[PDB]
Symmetry: C3
Amino acid sequence: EVTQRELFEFVLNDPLLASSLYINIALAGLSILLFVFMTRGLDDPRAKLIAVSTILVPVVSIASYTGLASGLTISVLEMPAGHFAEGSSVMLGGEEVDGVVTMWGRYLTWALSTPMILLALGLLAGSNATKLFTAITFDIAMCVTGLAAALTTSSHLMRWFWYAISCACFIVVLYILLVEWAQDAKAAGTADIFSTLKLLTVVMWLGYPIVWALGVEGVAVLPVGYTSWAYSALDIVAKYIFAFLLLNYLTSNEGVVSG
Amino acid sequence: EVTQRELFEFVLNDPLLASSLYINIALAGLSILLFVFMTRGLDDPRAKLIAVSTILVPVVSIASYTGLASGLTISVLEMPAGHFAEGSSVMLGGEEVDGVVTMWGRYLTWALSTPMILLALGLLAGSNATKLFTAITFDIAMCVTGLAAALTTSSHLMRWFWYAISCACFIVVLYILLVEWAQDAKAAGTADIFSTLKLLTVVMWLGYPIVWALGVEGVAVLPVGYTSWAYSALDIVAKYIFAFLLLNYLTSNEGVVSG
Amino acid sequence: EVTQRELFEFVLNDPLLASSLYINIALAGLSILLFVFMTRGLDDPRAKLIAVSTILVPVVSIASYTGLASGLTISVLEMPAGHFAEGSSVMLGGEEVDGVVTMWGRYLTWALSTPMILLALGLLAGSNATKLFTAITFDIAMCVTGLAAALTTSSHLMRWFWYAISCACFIVVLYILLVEWAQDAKAAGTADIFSTLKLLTVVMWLGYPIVWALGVEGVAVLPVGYTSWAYSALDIVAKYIFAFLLLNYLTSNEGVVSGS
Ligand SMILES: *C/C=C(C)/C=C/C=C(C)/C=C/C1=C(C)CCCC1(C)C
Ligand SMILES: *C/C=C(C)/C=C/C=C(C)/C=C/C1=C(C)CCCC1(C)C
Ligand SMILES: *C/C=C(C)/C=C/C=C(C)/C=C/C1=C(C)CCCC1(C)C
């Protein structure tokens, strides 16, 4: 009978875990303020659509980190036999319970933010509807199956099967990034900036599945505090710095992506 | 371990509460039928897009009220330390239980119905995609964070922090409603009706965050039965008569909204 | 009290229920490969929109069945007084638990795969955006209220009230398929194929509320293992062979639907 209150207090007392969360709550917030003033000059509906979806990324993030820091989107799950973290304890204060600290809150919200990054890139590269639809739907599938992976406590194999299904959807997104939109950006006349964000996106995302396999959800070698900082670190680049570069361009070349 | 049947029984047994839910199950159902009958004459696809988006509002409403009356989307939660309602008890049948009655089913479904209200209004006003995308996304972020606020029981401050994020998202919606679409409507030849609905929408929508703050979830000065009728009252205007007025216009001005 | 593992092991140790779930994880996966391979030569963006839409059906499906076999989207629920399955025991794990085995994960994912079946068909029929929006939102409403019906345990009358609402949403979808799109396909030059898939779709989809009614969720004349196999048999036709047939035509008539 673990309460939200114990999880909140649990996030505290553990400076490694606590800092990684609250730090982003503020970084996301400040990021929004900056982006709003940076795009005040835009007047082109198509140029402003690109900015709105870019700005929504940090918006989903503060909510995501707040949900986590609060204990709303965190849970104690008893891993299945054969699992490395199986047999673990946590102790939410004075009473220690069986299981591990599951921060499914991240996986859930990714289904919201990532489609937004993609919407941004896709529009920058003058993508057509079919390609946007394809990237976004498989991207969402990737996130939701990952969340199902983390919540599966009945069998060790099922958990990894989920992981596999998520990787397969990932390749579809990677494929449109590297191959499809890369070509479309040329006709749109944004291959320059597109190449930049594209290179950024792929590298950064590629790291999320890795941290997962290492952290308690997977092999369980990395501590929850480090895995959290890893993601927290990845989000900082995969989202905020990514948002700045894109917006910085949009304001300088509103005529390019106009129409 | 409160049961669903217990919350269902708790709704009945309480005249104020019972009537606020069951009356709207009937009004929304009657609204749907009336609205379908009123628009059976439309021919223009665009006019028809507006009519369906509008009819979906009471469709989501009847589902939402059934989810609450049946107890499926209600829960009894204990408020964090210092909350004005911490220490309250509810009493189900012959047993007394700690906590407050949280009708989170409303916050959740608003995420589906309010986007539809906005869809119909935006289109009626001749909005472009970028503004629709903006009103709608932040409208959803508003509803979702409001839900998070009602579901957060770990900290009193976290709750009001969720509420603040939600208010920020709300101003965005109000902005495009009061400024953006007010102008587009003139250009689309629908300023007369928009003005009536924009005024109705803004005044009514303002009432929800007030009701939330005054009820058990906030400073708890109003009983659960009172707060429920306040919302039901708002929905009757913000949803049903708002849809009647819009469809009555629509059915007499099919040509103007055609384009 | 009822753990996921107990549910995951209840499925296993019950040949019927297990096979009804694992066989479709396999069929769904084999369908994706086959469909991907079949659609390699497509080039027209609109033709490829219909293809990706169709392929997502079996993608949603493999994940769905994994969630049911893993026990992640299964629950034991107690039926309301008056329910023909009230007072039932599932005999979960070692103890005998009250209630019935509810596979709500099916209803949850339908809200994601059925809209894709509809996008493909609407597109194939050359439907405008208004009819597509109408069919899809009411389809989702139908799925969601069906899920709520199964998840409601407070009142027997409330369960059938959800069921009725959901049915009302269903007629909207059926009307768009049988009346609207049937005419639109004649203009899009896909009259025969759409009429064929329209009939396959209408016949199989009607099977669902019938199964729901006859199974544990309904009047309970069909045990859980049998209700599960009936759903799985319906999925094989309404999803996999349905997609197979649609893509078979598509890959031979890309020009007809090439449009924009
Ligand atoms: C702001 C967050 C971003 C950009 C997150 C990206 C996340 C991914 C690319 C996650 C991928 C995963 C897999 C491919 C396998 C299973 C587990 C996941 C969810 C970690
Ligand atoms: C049919 C329902 C309608 C029109 C609901 C409207 C709801 C709002 C405008 C809610 C706003 C809220 C805030 C601004 C602050 C936090 C709490 C909420 C969710 C009550
Ligand atoms: C891949 C799954 C398919 C094609 C599922 C189709 C499901 C339906 C047509 C369900 C309809 C239902 C009703 C009309 C009433 C209530 C219960 C349902 C959800 C079974």
